[PDB]
């Protein structure tokens, strides 16, 4: 009787564009689960990465 809107394909594509990134309201955003996705300890989030 209710299929949630976060399983629609538009939501899925827009989420896959972002990835596993969590926003913060007092700080720059951060990568979620930094061990199983193997983010190095110098990088905290995408905006703080600033790729060379």
């Amino acid at each position: 009787t209710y299929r949630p809107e976060s399983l629609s394909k538009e939501f899925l594509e827009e989420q896959a564009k972002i990835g596993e990134v969590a926003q913060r309201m007092n700080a720059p955003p951060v990568y979620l689960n930094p061990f199983t996705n193997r983010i190095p300890g110098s990088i905290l989030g995408p905006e703080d990465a600033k790729p060379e």
């Binding site: 949630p4 007092n26 951060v30």
Partner: protein, 153 residues
Amino acid sequence: MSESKDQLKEKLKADPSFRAELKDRIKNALLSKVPASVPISYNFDSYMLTEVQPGQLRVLEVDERLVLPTNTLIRLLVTASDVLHSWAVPALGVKMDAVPGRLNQVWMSINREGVFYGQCSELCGANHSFMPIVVEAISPRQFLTEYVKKWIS
């Protein structure tokens, strides 16, 4: 008059003990310019978001998060008002029940910044599924210079 002020400065030049005493008086006067203690206080509620956007997680996302500093020993006092609830954050290794009339303490210290999710882990009614927990962790200098300035009256 004015030479006695200059004679006081000459005694500052000559006597080391008077120099140390007037240095201590300078330290006493500089502590008087330090602002006094102010209380930080808040009381907000945290509710599940009914509709989420991409970049947010369904069921687990709230409107108001709990903001905690890192590398700090934090006491968490857990209680309830009507029925039994359990405050569970699986990433931080804390799961302790909220009992009406009890005040259960948790000692917690977070290693890294991030956004940690959780749910309630004690059956409490029809909407037991829809009480999620989100903890935002920031650095202690940000916490003590920017976040706590939001709660000064």
